[PDB]
Design a protein around this motif. Structure first.
Motif, PDB file in Angstrom:
ATOM      1  N   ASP B  27       4.351  20.974   2.907  1.00  0.00           N
ATOM      2  CA  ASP B  27       4.020  21.214   1.502  1.00  0.00           C
ATOM      3  C   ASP B  27       3.247  19.987   1.060  1.00  0.00           C
ATOM      4  N   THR B  28       1.958  19.989   1.376  1.00  0.00           N
ATOM      5  CA  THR B  28       1.074  18.889   1.029  1.00  0.00           C
ATOM      6  C   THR B  28      -0.332  19.456   0.891  1.00  0.00           C
ATOM      7  N   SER B  29      -1.236  18.688   0.295  1.00  0.00           N
ATOM      8  CA  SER B  29      -2.611  19.137   0.121  1.00  0.00           C
ATOM      9  C   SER B  29      -3.591  18.000   0.387  1.00  0.00           C
ATOM     10  N   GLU B  31      -5.918  17.223  -1.438  1.00  0.00           N
ATOM     11  CA  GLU B  31      -6.118  16.642  -2.761  1.00  0.00           C
ATOM     12  C   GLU B  31      -5.152  15.533  -3.058  1.00  0.00           C
ATOM     13  N   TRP B  32      -3.893  15.782  -2.745  1.00  0.00           N
ATOM     14  CA  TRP B  32      -2.855  14.798  -2.976  1.00  0.00           C
ATOM     15  C   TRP B  32      -3.045  13.621  -2.028  1.00  0.00           C
ATOM     16  N   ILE B  33      -2.917  13.895  -0.730  1.00  0.00           N
ATOM     17  CA  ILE B  33      -3.062  12.860   0.286  1.00  0.00           C
ATOM     18  C   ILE B  33      -4.253  11.950   0.020  1.00  0.00           C
ATOM     19  N   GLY B 212       8.275   3.923  -0.186  1.00  0.00           N
ATOM     20  CA  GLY B 212       6.951   3.890  -0.772  1.00  0.00           C
ATOM     21  C   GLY B 212       6.681   2.806  -1.796  1.00  0.00           C
ATOM     22  N   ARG B 213       7.267   2.940  -2.982  1.00  0.00           N
ATOM     23  CA  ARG B 213       7.053   1.978  -4.063  1.00  0.00           C
ATOM     24  C   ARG B 213       7.388   0.528  -3.709  1.00  0.00           C
ATOM     25  N   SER B 214       8.437   0.331  -2.918  1.00  0.00           N
ATOM     26  CA  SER B 214       8.829  -1.006  -2.494  1.00  0.00           C
ATOM     27  C   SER B 214       7.624  -1.708  -1.879  1.00  0.00           C
ATOM     28  N   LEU B 241      -8.568  -5.789   5.103  1.00  0.00           N
ATOM     29  CA  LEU B 241      -7.128  -5.675   4.928  1.00  0.00           C
ATOM     30  C   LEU B 241      -6.553  -4.496   5.691  1.00  0.00           C
ATOM     31  N   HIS B 242      -5.234  -4.494   5.850  1.00  0.00           N
ATOM     32  CA  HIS B 242      -4.554  -3.401   6.525  1.00  0.00           C
ATOM     33  C   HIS B 242      -4.937  -2.141   5.758  1.00  0.00           C
ATOM     34  N   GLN B 243      -5.377  -1.124   6.483  1.00  0.00           N
ATOM     35  CA  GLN B 243      -5.836   0.115   5.868  1.00  0.00           C
ATOM     36  C   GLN B 243      -4.777   1.159   5.519  1.00  0.00           C
ATOM     37  N   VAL B 246      -6.023   3.085  -0.100  1.00  0.00           N
ATOM     38  CA  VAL B 246      -7.178   2.557  -0.820  1.00  0.00           C
ATOM     39  C   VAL B 246      -6.766   2.096  -2.215  1.00  0.00           C
ATOM     40  N   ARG B 247      -5.825   2.820  -2.816  1.00  0.00           N
ATOM     41  CA  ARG B 247      -5.321   2.486  -4.141  1.00  0.00           C
ATOM     42  C   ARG B 247      -4.740   1.080  -4.094  1.00  0.00           C
ATOM     43  N   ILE B 248      -4.168   0.706  -2.955  1.00  0.00           N
ATOM     44  CA  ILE B 248      -3.577  -0.616  -2.808  1.00  0.00           C
ATOM     45  C   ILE B 248      -4.689  -1.657  -2.790  1.00  0.00           C
ATOM     46  N   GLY B 271      -6.620   6.899   8.750  1.00  0.00           N
ATOM     47  CA  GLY B 271      -5.292   6.802   8.160  1.00  0.00           C
ATOM     48  C   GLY B 271      -4.688   5.440   8.482  1.00  0.00           C
ATOM     49  N   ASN B 272      -3.380   5.277   8.293  1.00  0.00           N
ATOM     50  CA  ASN B 272      -2.725   4.000   8.587  1.00  0.00           C
ATOM     51  C   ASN B 272      -2.371   3.870  10.081  1.00  0.00           C
ATOM     52  N   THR B 273      -3.155   3.066  10.814  1.00  0.00           N
ATOM     53  CA  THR B 273      -2.938   2.845  12.249  1.00  0.00           C
ATOM     54  C   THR B 273      -2.235   1.517  12.480  1.00  0.00           C
TER      55      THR B 273
HETATM   56  C1  LIG Z   1       2.452  -1.272   5.009  1.00  0.00           C
HETATM   57  C2  LIG Z   1       1.872   0.255   5.254  1.00  0.00           C
HETATM   58  O1  LIG Z   1       1.533   0.186   6.519  1.00  0.00           O
HETATM   59  S1  LIG Z   1       2.064   1.496   4.383  1.00  0.00           S
HETATM   60  C3  LIG Z   1       1.639   0.886   2.731  1.00  0.00           C
HETATM   61  C4  LIG Z   1       2.456   1.623   1.700  1.00  0.00           C
HETATM   62  N1  LIG Z   1       1.675   2.852   1.395  1.00  0.00           N
HETATM   63  C5  LIG Z   1       1.733   3.677   0.393  1.00  0.00           C
HETATM   64  O2  LIG Z   1       2.254   3.211  -0.665  1.00  0.00           O
HETATM   65  C6  LIG Z   1       1.523   5.196   0.611  1.00  0.00           C
HETATM   66  C7  LIG Z   1       0.607   5.743  -0.494  1.00  0.00           C
HETATM   67  N2  LIG Z   1       1.246   5.928  -1.821  1.00  0.00           N
HETATM   68  C8  LIG Z   1       2.142   6.886  -2.270  1.00  0.00           C
HETATM   69  O3  LIG Z   1       2.474   7.943  -1.643  1.00  0.00           O
HETATM   70  C9  LIG Z   1       2.482   6.829  -3.814  1.00  0.00           C
HETATM   71  O4  LIG Z   1       1.288   6.678  -4.612  1.00  0.00           O
HETATM   72  C10 LIG Z   1       3.611   5.731  -4.334  1.00  0.00           C
HETATM   73  C11 LIG Z   1       3.139   4.289  -4.029  1.00  0.00           C
HETATM   74  C12 LIG Z   1       3.893   5.796  -5.853  1.00  0.00           C
HETATM   75  C13 LIG Z   1       5.018   5.884  -3.634  1.00  0.00           C
HETATM   76  O5  LIG Z   1       5.356   7.262  -3.329  1.00  0.00           O
HETATM   77  P1  LIG Z   1       6.903   7.839  -3.429  1.00  0.00           P
HETATM   78  O6  LIG Z   1       7.856   6.650  -3.804  1.00  0.00           O
HETATM   79  O7  LIG Z   1       7.413   8.403  -2.074  1.00  0.00           O
HETATM   80  O8  LIG Z   1       6.867   8.991  -4.655  1.00  0.00           O
HETATM   81  P2  LIG Z   1       5.694   9.378  -5.814  1.00  0.00           P
HETATM   82  O9  LIG Z   1       5.970   8.560  -7.130  1.00  0.00           O
HETATM   83  O10 LIG Z   1       4.193   9.150  -5.385  1.00  0.00           O
HETATM   84  O11 LIG Z   1       6.026  10.992  -5.987  1.00  0.00           O
HETATM   85  C14 LIG Z   1       5.173  12.011  -5.460  1.00  0.00           C
HETATM   86  C15 LIG Z   1       5.989  13.229  -5.067  1.00  0.00           C
HETATM   87  O12 LIG Z   1       5.291  13.952  -4.027  1.00  0.00           O
HETATM   88  C16 LIG Z   1       6.015  13.952  -2.738  1.00  0.00           C
HETATM   89  N3  LIG Z   1       5.054  13.684  -1.665  1.00  0.00           N
HETATM   90  C17 LIG Z   1       4.891  12.608  -0.758  1.00  0.00           C
HETATM   91  N4  LIG Z   1       3.776  12.961   0.031  1.00  0.00           N
HETATM   92  C18 LIG Z   1       3.330  14.126  -0.371  1.00  0.00           C
HETATM   93  C19 LIG Z   1       2.240  14.950   0.069  1.00  0.00           C
HETATM   94  N5  LIG Z   1       1.494  14.506   1.082  1.00  0.00           N
HETATM   95  N6  LIG Z   1       2.034  16.172  -0.598  1.00  0.00           N
HETATM   96  C20 LIG Z   1       2.808  16.616  -1.638  1.00  0.00           C
HETATM   97  N7  LIG Z   1       3.890  15.833  -2.096  1.00  0.00           N
HETATM   98  C21 LIG Z   1       4.148  14.599  -1.468  1.00  0.00           C
HETATM   99  C22 LIG Z   1       7.090  12.824  -2.986  1.00  0.00           C
HETATM  100  O13 LIG Z   1       8.159  12.763  -2.022  1.00  0.00           O
HETATM  101  C23 LIG Z   1       7.409  13.038  -4.428  1.00  0.00           C
HETATM  102  O14 LIG Z   1       8.148  14.219  -4.715  1.00  0.00           O
HETATM  103  P3  LIG Z   1       9.777  14.354  -4.345  1.00  0.00           P
HETATM  104  O15 LIG Z   1      10.378  12.959  -4.894  1.00  0.00           O
HETATM  105  O16 LIG Z   1      10.211  15.647  -5.174  1.00  0.00           O
HETATM  106  O17 LIG Z   1       9.920  14.586  -2.764  1.00  0.00           O
END
Ligand SMILES: CC(=O)SCCNC(=O)CCNC(=O)[C@H](O)C(C)(C)COP(=O)(O)OP(=O)(O)OC[C@H]1O[C@@H](n2cnc3c(N)ncnc32)[C@H](O)[C@@H]1OP(=O)(O)O
Ligand SMILES: CC(=O)SCCNC(=O)CCNC(=O)[C@H](O)C(C)(C)COP(=O)(O)OP(=O)(O)OC[C@H]1O[C@@H](n2cnc3c(N)ncnc32)[C@H](O)[C@@H]1OP(=O)(O)O
Lengths: 318, 317
Positions: B27-29, B31-33, B212-214, B241-243, B246-248, B271-273
């Motif tokens: 359940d993803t799109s 658009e979201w990703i 995620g947020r952490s 930077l680590h990829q 992009v929002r980061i 993606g993130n490799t």
């Molecule tokens: C160090 C690295 O190598 S990784 C770096 C860290 N990377 C990232 O932060 C990943 C990109 N960012 C994100 O996904 C978000 O923008 C963040 C930062 C706010 C954190 O995401 P999360 O804490 O998991 O929840 P978020 O506030 O975005 O909520 C989105 C909702 O969609 C869900 N979701 C996650 N991926 C998808 C997806 N691909 N399609 C649809 N829904 C999704 C979530 O689980 C949540 O719903 P649920 O709580 O009912 O399951």
């Protein structure tokens, strides 16, 4: 003042002690076979703790013993091949565990040579003048990788950790080194194979440890004796701390090497094969017994060998 | 005794997987990703493992550079998805290319593994004991992921890339800052191997999991501080930077106050490799001519992730 030196040693092994007798009661093996083949009589096997806990203890001890506080640590290197996770690294777990907020860390994957490799790495870091204080720890928990029914390997490995506190000095200690490897024999000793089961994987490629006895035996005796003679000669060495795999191996190396056997310190009878932790356990133990004494300026060589294949020696003055 | 990157190279599985093929699995799109990471596709192995990917990178560094494996003094592989605990991918690569004269090992520093590993090489060369080596960052997360957890399955890809490093007469690695925070190690974890021995009594998930947020909040705050430690908008030309997202990179470029066009992006195709993200981006930038070895551009390489680990390297290409 870019010269590193080992300034504090420490070890830690699971309180649990397992003798060859308790094993002979689990497999078709005996205390007389195991011992006369390796010199191993007992081992320590975790019952609750993992690699990170064992290493945590070693680090903790280095600080308590040295009076140095975690904030003083510039870095932490853990040589392991039985880490808790792929990520985080045991080093990072240990860092957070002791609150060494100012240090960066990572584990090094070099099997039974991990400590000599890791240690050398640290010398490079200190020599760079960038870093002055660090912890090099070798920790392992093989019990969790072994097939306790395959007597072939189950009787050799044990759990444990040990390390040293390393800091810059004005006088040089790490005299010379020779690190080697031969990946064309990697198959000789392997563990931890994680299989791909993703929906995309279409290849048809055993998580437990499996090794070729003779291969490694023959290899060690030859390739290692060569690596040791590269650095010293009986006449130019005081003590040698080799990977504690088998006493028969050390016995054959001391012979080929033409170096007084009394210099090759042994430990396996009490801990078995702890891989990357074997040498630092033996070192701390030797320091404790007074056989080795920091500051004494004793010419010591540390040599490890195993999975990779990897092997290497370090000529340093304690 | 001064190291310098003198040849780059990359390699990723042919298998291209788009956000659309994934939306079909969970359940993803797209658009979201895409709007949250900037990722449109990844590379997922079908018959290859980490060692195979790294093997190519090495192989290619030699071809491109004309060097012979016998000339390699060492090999460092930064991975967190290795074939086995032992041997190390580095050793497999070593035997695979016949680099009989080099010693090798993997470094475990997650998404910071390349910057960490690279730094490590620097010291080795600076020591005057070694003057040629291969630093490769390779990964195969597809095997670690739970392909039903849309939370992580849509972020990671497979891949490898590295550089050929040799000693020079002039200094290139200007300044560096390596950090870690093991107190949040729980934020991103994978590969937990459980102890099932007859002696283990403790009652303590092999697949990757992360907060995620952490990590998001952490990267933006701690990484920006790290980067500013080494440079400022005017004292840097490019930043790799680590990829991860992009929002980061966007939020960092902001707080950092460094021209956004200086942060090169690449996650849309891979993606993130993790540990392979930066070197893939670097080899790609070099190919594209954006970066040019010998040009002496102010470049900083910064990684962050599992550990927590993070660190930057200020060097002149
Ligand atoms: C160090 C690295 O190598 S990784 C770096 C860290 N990377 C990232 O932060 C990943 C990109 N960012 C994100 O996904 C978000 O923008 C963040 C930062 C706010 C954190 O995401 P999360 O804490 O998991 O929840 P978020 O506030 O975005 O909520 C989105 C909702 O969609 C869900 N979701 C996650 N991926 C998808 C997806 N691909 N399609 C649809 N829904 C999704 C979530 O689980 C949540 O719903 P649920 O709580 O009912 O399951
Ligand atoms: C690098 C490391 O970290 S470990 C270093 C490598 N160390 C070792 O060699 C492990 C300890 N030593 C041994 O295995 C022996 O000394 C070796 C290497 C000579 C055996 O080599 P091999 O030629 O393959 O076997 P060998 O011909 O000597 O016979 C061994 C026999 O013991 C048996 N055996 C294996 N483990 C056990 C055990 N725990 N108890 C009783 N028998 C055992 C074998 O199955 C075999 O039986 P067999 O005679 O019916 O075939």
């Amino acid at each position: 003042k870019n010269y590193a030196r080992i300034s504090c040693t420490s070890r830690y092994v699971p309180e649990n002690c397992v003798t060859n007798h308790q094993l002979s009661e689990m497999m078709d093996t005996s205390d007389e076979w195991i011992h006369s083949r390796t010199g191993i009589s007992e081992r320590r096997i975790v019952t609750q703790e993992n690699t990170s806990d064992l290493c945590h203890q070693v680090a903790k001890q280095l600080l308590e013993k040295s009076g140095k506080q975690a904030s003083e640590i510039d870095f932490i290197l853990v040589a392991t091949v039985t880490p808790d996770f792929n990520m985080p690294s045991v080093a990072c777990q240990v860092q957070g565990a002791i609150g060494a907020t100012e240090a960066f860390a990572f584990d090094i994957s070099a099997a039974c040579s991990g400590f000599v490799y890791a240690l050398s790495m640290a010398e490079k870091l200190v020599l760079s003048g960038r870093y002055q204080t660090g912890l090099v720890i070798g920790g392992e928990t093989f019990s969790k990788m072994l097939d306790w029914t395959d007597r072939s390997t189950a009787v050799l490995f044990g759990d444990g950790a040990a390390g040293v506190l390393i800091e810059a000095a004005e006088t040089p200690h790490f005299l010379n080194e020779k690190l080697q490897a031969d990946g064309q024999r990697w198959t000789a000793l392997t563990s931890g194979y994680t299989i791909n089961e993703s929906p995309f994987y279409q290849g048809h490629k055993s998580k437990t440890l499996q090794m070729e006895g003779r291969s490694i035996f023959d290899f060690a005796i030859k390739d290692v004796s060569q690596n040791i003679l590269s650095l010293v000669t009986d006449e130019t060495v005081d003590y040698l701390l080799l990977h504690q795999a088998s006493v028969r191996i050390i016995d054959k190396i001391a012979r080929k090497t033409k170096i007084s056997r009394e210099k090759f310190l042994t430990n396996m009878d009490k801990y078995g094969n702890t891989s990357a932790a074997s040498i630092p356990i033996l070192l701390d133990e030797a320091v404790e017994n007074g056989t080795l004494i920091l500051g004494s300026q004793q010419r010591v060589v540390l040599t490890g060998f195993g999975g990779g294949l990897t092997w290497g020696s370090l000529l340093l003055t304690l």
